Amino acid sequence: PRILNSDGSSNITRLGLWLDDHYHDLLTVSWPVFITLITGLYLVTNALFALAYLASGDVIENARPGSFTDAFFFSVQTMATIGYGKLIPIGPLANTLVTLEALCGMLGMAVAASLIYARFTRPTAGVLFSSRMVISDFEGKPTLMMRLANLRIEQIIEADVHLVLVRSEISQEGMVFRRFHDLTLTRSRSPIFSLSWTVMHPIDHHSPIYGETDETLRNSHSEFLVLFTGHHEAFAQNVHARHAYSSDEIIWGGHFVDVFTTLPDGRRALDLGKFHEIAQHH
Amino acid sequence: PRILNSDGSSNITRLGLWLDDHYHDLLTVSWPVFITLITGLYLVTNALFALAYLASGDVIENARPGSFTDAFFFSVQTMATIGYGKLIPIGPLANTLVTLEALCGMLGMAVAASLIYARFTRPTAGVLFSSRMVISDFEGKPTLMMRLANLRIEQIIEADVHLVLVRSEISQEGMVFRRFHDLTLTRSRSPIFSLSWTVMHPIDHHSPIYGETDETLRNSHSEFLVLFTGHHEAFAQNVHARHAYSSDEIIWGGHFVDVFTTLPDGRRALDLGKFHEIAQHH
Amino acid sequence: PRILNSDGSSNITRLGLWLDDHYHDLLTVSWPVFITLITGLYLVTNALFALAYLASGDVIENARPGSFTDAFFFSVQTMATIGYGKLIPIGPLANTLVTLEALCGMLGMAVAASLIYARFTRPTAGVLFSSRMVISDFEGKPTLMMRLANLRIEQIIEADVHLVLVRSEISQEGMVFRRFHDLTLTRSRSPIFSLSWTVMHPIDHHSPIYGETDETLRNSHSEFLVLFTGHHEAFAQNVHARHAYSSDEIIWGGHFVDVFTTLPDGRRALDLGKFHEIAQHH
Amino acid sequence: PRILNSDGSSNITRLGLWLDDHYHDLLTVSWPVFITLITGLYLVTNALFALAYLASGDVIENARPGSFTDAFFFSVQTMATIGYGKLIPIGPLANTLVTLEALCGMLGMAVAASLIYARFTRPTAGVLFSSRMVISDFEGKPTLMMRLANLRIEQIIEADVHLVLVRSEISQEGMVFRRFHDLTLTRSRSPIFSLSWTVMHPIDHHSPIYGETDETLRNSHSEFLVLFTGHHEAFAQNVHARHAYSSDEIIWGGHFVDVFTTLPDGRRALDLGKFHEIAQHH
Ligand SMILES: CCCCCCCC
Ligand SMILES: CCCCCCCC
Ligand SMILES: CCCCCCCC
Ligand SMILES: CCCCCCCC
Ligand SMILES: [K+]
Ligand SMILES: [K+]
Ligand SMILES: [K+]
Ligand SMILES: [K+]
Ligand SMILES: [K+]
Ligand SMILES: [K+]
Ligand SMILES: [K+]
Ligand SMILES: [K+]
Ligand SMILES: [K+]
Ligand SMILES: [K+]
Ligand SMILES: [K+]
Ligand SMILES: [K+]
Ligand SMILES: [K+]
């Protein structure tokens, strides 16, 4: 059983300990649930105002007296500011409620618009993670590697990547805890990430996986968490992406196949079909 | 008397030295005060325009001449853009004021909407601080600890924590000042904060609390300030949270009870009911 | 003649080398100029549409034929979406222009609103700089100092300060250039800036002002640039503030008077009236 | 053939591997294509509603029965909330569709406004890169240099620059890959970038171009990538700019001509006409 999902999530059941977190909930519900809630408020509030018009007499011209249907659509046409002409307020009481309803609709529209904007303008990084990792020799040291690819043409600037080892360990006192280890990389910052980025961790005497083998990583239930962050030119916003690997997904001795190929014309090309391809010696 | 409140605020009375800070004030007033101010401008400006229509003659059809009530609701129906039909401008003077009023309402609506958005889209971190701290041995050193918990399912990426010692000290010259000490942590950056995070400060010869005891921390009036910062996936915005501890809230020899429990099914679980539980030896 | 103004600006005349920078210009013009430009577009575009209605015949009911005045206010009432009733489109040509005008007004309103929001939501740090600096002994070293004060109750988190020396220097080749020197501080990051922050630069053998005197700083035309940055809780946005000092504004041997005073009640207080006070020995 | 364009882009053909990326596409299409798509939805949705009114009978007063033209403009006047008066809904079915259409238009307007804002508020850094680089002696070491200029009066705070060497290299195993080298600079952070900034890389034993010549940089196909980032006061947003140089654009022995000149009045001036001027010895 893996403690981190492939997408970077945690696979832990939350035991624990309708308006205490209203701003969060309105942003995280699905769009159908969101559109439903907005429609609800839109109707409930109109009904309320419709009842406020009947509670002061027949103050709506060309409206069947005491008819809720005719009063509702007058509220609709008032809150929306359509103002057809047939239905119109008469009497100082109705005109004051109209004044209030218009204010209430503007304030509610601004809140709904704020939430729509906040939900809609959530960019995705468009970054692809290698399905596996590898441990092969690079510059004379065994090196843990994975790689990233930009699925869009627009570039990502000040791109950062963080490679975390997650394994169970035993302290000097004998306490069995789960520790996170920041793994030093040859390059943790790519100022302009455009195409493909091979991320490397030299396994030297300082590495927390020095001397480890395929077996020891399983016994410690080792996992590898990857976080990517950058500023996407397409959106002019920051983006991020997360991924996680299990020890079973490290191909020892593997080499990532070059995704850069030379066309017959001499043009340098990027073939992402080889992105997950790994060469093994037998 | 504590100099920092539990929530991270300062407990200092500001001796010191209605429009000099209008943007700040409009964002910091309570919602009832905010809604009240907006309603005020909404009525005052309409009244002003209503008086601008009477100051040019009876230029409102179906409106009692010189009646402010009928002129006000015409301004309302004009600023809001309802445009029922009974009340309508007549004469080039009224139609020019209508043109101005519509412009004034759009500009005011945009400012009101900007403020609403700015006030509404203020996410909260949803982070829980341990009620106490502890000082127990970890990896062979006495270690100061507290811990954090994410009260939501959505993860927080690039989470940072900063642990500051605040105590009165005496310089070589004899000046008694209050100094802030950044306390080095085993982990100050958690790339993906999902569940629980135990923060640790090894008390070695470099620590500003090396050799200190429960008594010395009180005599120096020592306090501990904690700041948390991260990027919350739920909101796609940054969040932060602050907390402060007094020396009286350090449980020497204490150990935080594990909040990770193993269910009978083998599923890993998170029980936040034990989050504030601390084990003491007697 | 000083090369940096007290507010951090540069005092250099730009020799150099109406729509090439439209987004910048619309954000930087004064509000009167901005409101004027928006009003302009609002009238010009309405006039244009008014001429588009006459160029297709008398397609406006209750409108004097060929009258521009009556056609303009119909465009106003259409672009604003008031729709009184007297003036109404007749014929497929007018109704198509109405359809276009409504689209054009919505698109223009969205751009105007975007600019209003972008201009309006520009918070100010509310930070006060000490009028002078000082060089006195602290912890056994001559230390350059200034201090900052938060003029608001809301706190600023992850506050950074940067102290830059700016002076003319001569390279080994003999080139006379103006170099910026980052001055190391005892604390460059205050995780929670609430009240007052004394910023200190120990003048040791590593400092670029080691061995300098009041005279040498003038001969080199030394200046000191200060930048402050933080995340203001009042606005939930980042803020910054800049200041610059001349050598003539360093009080050698000076000590900033404590702004923290003890009231008779035992409450700790902050008296910003002493913020610019400096003690000198004679 | 150069692998990086002068503007920092990559010159690689993407081989690869209409709604899968809708938010990205709507932000990256040209304004004519964007305005066209918005106009499309604006008409298609109105047509749909127009057909929803005919599919329930002649429920539009003063509208030719079964006429799509008259029903379309009623939808327009309803979605836009103009509400002239001639065309008006009759029957509970039409008034319910009107209620729905108004809701649909508000929701669509909010999405369109969000996209407009997101597209419009994309500031440009206004930064100028030197057309060439140089390698001359500075402080006793051969130093690689280029420089930047602020084309606007407003200052940029916390300005960062990153200089990356890009060249083909051979690992100990014999693998021919393209490596990025972060080049250490005398100053990588300018807290307040106002005028001109000469960026310098001392070529010492640590530099990856130590011992290299004009010939060796070509044989390795060396290129130099520059990224600039800062917070622009004009916009209160972050900005960035990228540039790339080829080995053919390094002027060995060159010196950038001083852009700071002394006027006859003693005022310090900035002449950006000399910004690309470089002095060579013969
Ligand atoms: C002030 C509300 C008027 C129309 C909607 C705009 C809200 C963002
Ligand atoms: C330009 C104002 C029209 C309606 C309100 C939108 C302001 C955000
Ligand atoms: C889509 C424009 C309708 C009203 C103004 C809202 C623009 C932010
Ligand atoms: C809620 C929509 C009403 C008018 C347009 C405002 C959308 C930002
Ligand atoms: K409205
Ligand atoms: K209307
Ligand atoms: K009407
Ligand atoms: K909006
Ligand atoms: K907005
Ligand atoms: K409006
Ligand atoms: K808005
Ligand atoms: K409108
Ligand atoms: K807005
Ligand atoms: K509308
Ligand atoms: K309207
Ligand atoms: K409207
Ligand atoms: K908007």
Residue numbers in the entry:
A (entry chain A), B (entry chain A), C (entry chain A), D (entry chain A): 12 to 28, 33 to 297
What does the paper say about this structure?
We have utilised the prokaryotic Kir channel KirBac3.1 to determine whether the acyl tails of bound lipids, protruding into the conduction pathway through fenestrations just below the selectivity filter, might represent key gating elements. In KirBac3.1, the four Leu124 residues form a steric cluster physically occluding the conduction pathway, separating the cavity into upper and lower vestibules, while Tyr132 (at the inner helix bundle) forms a non-occlusive hourglass-shaped portal between lower vestibule and cytosol. Here we present evidence that in Kir channels, a limiting barrier to permeation within the conduction pathway is formed by a collar of branched aliphatic side chains. We show that acyl tails of tightly bound lipids occupying conserved fenestrations into the pore engage individual side chains of the collar, drawing them away from the central conduction pathway and allowing ions to pass.
Reasoning that the chemistry of the contributing side chains determines their mutual affinity and propensity to form a steric barrier, we mutated the branched aliphatic residue Leu124 to the linear methionine, which is similar in both molecular volume and hydrophobicity, but more flexible. Conversely, L124M assays showed enhanced channel activity, significantly outperforming KirBac3.1 in the fluorometric assay. We determined a crystal structure of L124M in case the increased activity was due to structural distortion (such as forcing the inner helices apart). The mutation was made on a background in which two native cysteines were mutated to serine (C71S-C262S; SCS) and thus we also determined a structure of the KirBac3.1-SCS background crystallised under the same conditions. We also carried out single-channel recordings of the reconstituted L124M channels in lipid bilayers, revealing currents exhibiting the sub-conductance states typifying KirBac3.113. We also carried out simulations on the L124M mutant, using the crystal structure as a starting model, finding a negligible barrier to K+ permeation at the collar. We reasoned that if the leucine collar is the primary permeation gate and the role of the lipid tails is to competitively displace individual leucine side chains, thereby compromising the collar, lipids should not be required for permeation in the L124M mutant with its labile methionine sidechains. Indeed, L124M with all four Tyr57 adopting gauche rotamers appeared as effective at conducting K+ as wild type KirBac3.1 with all Tyr57 side chains trans, indicating that the interaction with aliphatic lipid tails in wild type is only required because of the inflexible steric occlusion created by Leu124 residues. In simulations, the L124M mutant was able to conduct even when lipid tails were prevented from entering fenestrations, demonstrating the unbranched aliphatic residue methionine does not form a significant barrier to permeation; L124M is essentially ungated.
